[PDB]
Design an enzyme around this catalytic site. Structure first.
Site, PDB file in Angstrom:
ATOM      1  N   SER B  82       0.811  -1.114  -0.008  1.00 24.89           N
ATOM      2  CA  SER B  82       0.148   0.054   0.064  1.00 24.89           C
ATOM      3  C   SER B  82       0.873   1.213   0.059  1.00 24.89           C
ATOM      4  CB  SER B  82      -0.933   0.055   1.064  1.00 24.89           C
ATOM      5  OG  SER B  82      -0.098   0.130   2.373  1.00 24.89           O
ATOM      6  N   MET B 117       3.735   7.722 -10.184  1.00 24.40           N
ATOM      7  CA  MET B 117       5.031   8.678 -10.397  1.00 24.40           C
ATOM      8  C   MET B 117       6.409   8.195 -10.093  1.00 24.40           C
ATOM      9  SD  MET B 117       2.983  12.107  -9.020  1.00 24.40           S
ATOM     10  CE  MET B 117       1.691  11.259  -7.985  1.00 24.40           C
ATOM     11  N   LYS B 136       9.477   5.096  -1.537  1.00 16.66           N
ATOM     12  CA  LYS B 136       9.808   4.616  -2.744  1.00 16.66           C
ATOM     13  C   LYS B 136      11.272   4.609  -2.904  1.00 16.66           C
ATOM     14  CE  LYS B 136       5.221   4.206  -4.401  1.00 16.66           C
ATOM     15  NZ  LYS B 136       4.352   4.680  -5.404  1.00 16.66           N
ATOM     16  N   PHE B 158      -3.841   5.464 -12.656  1.00 15.39           N
ATOM     17  CA  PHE B 158      -5.034   4.385 -12.781  1.00 15.39           C
ATOM     18  C   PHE B 158      -6.207   5.052 -12.950  1.00 15.39           C
ATOM     19  CE2 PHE B 158      -3.011   1.467  -8.973  1.00 15.39           C
ATOM     20  CZ  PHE B 158      -1.988   1.560  -9.553  1.00 15.39           C
TER      21      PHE B 158
END
Ligand code: NDP
Ligand code: NDP
Ligand code: GFR
Ligand code: GFR
EC number: 1.23.1.1
Lengths: 309, 309
Positions: B82, B117, B136, B158
């Site tokens: 998530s 992104m 990330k 999405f």
């Protein structure tokens, strides 16, 4: 040919009832409420219903006229409103829906959110678990006070909640080594695959034999004691489980010190497994679903548990 | 023959990656964690994965050894952890999974939870939304520091979150009469159906051409301004929408007084729709999914939007 509106269409039993209605050939309408804004799984569920041919009907329980319009489109209303404390327990919101059905006067039958213990037989239940049945009784009284024809679907434990876990409360999966047996484990319980419950619901809602009746879901091969159910699992796995018997007094020990929603679950379990409320009375074949609908080859609990091996 | 373990298998994009792996023919394993034993929808997704031939692998992020055992079973690990503030934002939990992969040493390729992104291009992002890209990035560094081979999948919105709603933040459905256009509505955005994202992911993970590479999902016909997106919808419905232009400053006004999740979203939208971060740079055909996998008939945003008619 029969037009049906499902309220609570994205719910656990609701979405199954929707698909069952499509499969049964009902012209199927589902209520899409505006409040489900960023709930993507609800939105996409509605999208899938539409792809299979359901009809989206926008309406809100904050907009009495939207509800009147919606139920003006159909012959039968089925409600799957939530009624589990650890999920949400808004059974009384159906009162607004009863009042809309009343105003519209075209509904030939209403099925309220039941699908559980038979409320009029639960008058002795302990709070807070008792609230479920009181609220469903209140909705019944609103329906009858209004002269709305009805069918009440009752009788069976949802398999996923009582079968798949060998009726252990902590989980939805079979236990690995050890299992609790409530009492001696010799109280008959009724278990039904929720897909069958939905199938029965779609078949009864235009059955003239069930207008103004209670319909019991009690499939004969699925009347089983907890010990029988646990033994079905020992057969499938070939492994005996270490069983511990729990006397009622120790089941309930310190219940008053537990979060409300868990007290309610414990209470429901007590009525089912210790009092045997689902099997302590007789029902005739004229008011039992597997006998009313014998073409439905209901899933037996050995097959149901197999999907867990 | 390629064996893939999906971590995050019941998530929004994760569950689609699971199916796309099965559909691609991979031998597909899904991490079933003990913590989700009482969440009925997750439990029944795993049963449904099982029915399609996925293999359940029990493991827990709180049990480093269960992870090592799990990754040891496969050739490729895909993480769909998530990373959205109004849902759950546990990107950095992946670090425990990187640890397990390093120790186990058999893993040929890891796809971290990217799918959006391009983090390394977001150095200037608006806090708190910035967190997504910083976290990330931290995961990427652990991956490379361990010498784990990788593919990073990035670059598309999405469709459900940005196209089905004509990019209106409030909602997941198209608006009925009015729409906000951000700026002049002439900044190009990348949209992709999430099933195509999952398909490209299943196809890229055993592809030599993308080992240790960033794969961009930039399907040419789906590079659209917001006005272009809105005109698709007006052509489908045949109804013109009333349009209001929103200047950057008014869009960002009083953002520091918003709930943190909404601060994040507002920030991401700004980089996408005002700065054009998804299209402010070019990418080659050897690093763009639709070019690498032209067999994939990706869904265009007119086909996508038809679902809502
Ligand atoms: N073992 C058994 O026999 C079981 C019986 N039950 C019973 O089945 C029935 C449904 O239970 P379940 O499927 O778990 O319900 P859910 O928790 O899945 O919720 C069902 C629907 O209720 C609607 N809902 C919730 N809150 C509101 C609200 N404020 N206003 C309007 N609609 C609301 C939602 O409809 P929407 O889709 O429109 O958002 C939701 O999808 C209940 O009567 C329950 O007592 C349930 C579990 C076990
Ligand atoms: N427009 C775009 O490009 C979009 C990009 N994304 C990105 O996609 C990626 C996945 O997002 P999304 O599908 O929304 O993820 P979800 O919010 O659906 O969660 C995915 C999985 O993360 C697991 N999870 C959450 N918390 C934990 C935890 N403490 N420990 C272990 N597992 C946990 C769960 O795995 P389990 O199944 O085991 O329970 C869950 O299913 C993210 O990086 C996100 O940034 C997402 C939305 C839009
Ligand atoms: C069997 O009739 C009913 C049964 C339920 C079952 C509820 C199902 O979700 C069950 C549940 C509650 C708490 C738990 O810890 C649990 O663990 C499996 C299951 C509930 C037990 O009351 C609710 C209303 C009913 O009328
Ligand atoms: C496009 O790249 C990303 C996109 C997202 C999309 C996030 C998706 O969930 C989106 C969303 C948030 C708040 C909203 O009100 C919303 O309305 C549709 C959508 C988020 C917008 O930032 C997250 C991480 C990314 O790297």
């Amino acid at each position: 040919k029969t037009r049906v509106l499902v309220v609570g269409a994205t719910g656990y039993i609701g979405k199954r009832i929707v698909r069952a209605c499509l499969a049964e050939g009902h012209e199927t309408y589902v209520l899409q409420r505006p409040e489900i804004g960023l709930e993507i799984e609800k939105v996409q569920l509605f999208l899938s219903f539409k792809k299979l041919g359901a009809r989206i009907v926008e309406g809100s329980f904050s907009d009495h006229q939207s509800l009147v319009s919606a139920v003006k489109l159909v012959d039968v209303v089925v409600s799957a409103m939530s009624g589990v404390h650890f999920r949400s327990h808004n059974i009384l919101v159906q009162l607004k829906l009863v009042e809309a059905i009343k105003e519209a006067g075209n509904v030939k039958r209403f099925l309220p959110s039941e699908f559980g213990m038979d409320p009029p037989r639960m008058g002795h239940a302990l709070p807070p678990g008792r609230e479920t049945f009181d609220q469903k009784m209140e909705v019944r009284q609103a329906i009858e006070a209004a002269g709305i024809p009805y069918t009440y679907v009752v009788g069976a434990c949802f398999a996923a909640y009582f079968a798949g876990n060998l009726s252990q409360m902590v989980t939805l999966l079979p236990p690995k080594e050890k299992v609790n047996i409530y009492g001696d484990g010799n109280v008959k319980v009724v278990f039904a695959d929720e897909d069958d419950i939905a199938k029965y619901t779609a078949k009864t809602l235009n059955d003239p034999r069930t207008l103004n009746k209670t319909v019991n879901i009690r499939p004969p091969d699925n009347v089983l004691t907890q010990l029988e159910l646990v033994q079905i699992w020992e057969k499938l796995t070939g492994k005996e489980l270490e069983k511990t018997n729990i006397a009622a007094q120790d089941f309930l020990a310190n219940i008053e010190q537990m979060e409300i929603p868990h007290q309610a679950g414990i209470g429901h379990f007590y009525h089912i497994f210790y009092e045997g409320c689902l099997t302590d009375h007789e029902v005739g074949e004229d008011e039992e679903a597997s006998s009313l609908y014998p073409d439905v080859k209901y899933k037996r609990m050995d097959d149901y548990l197999r999907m867990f091996l």
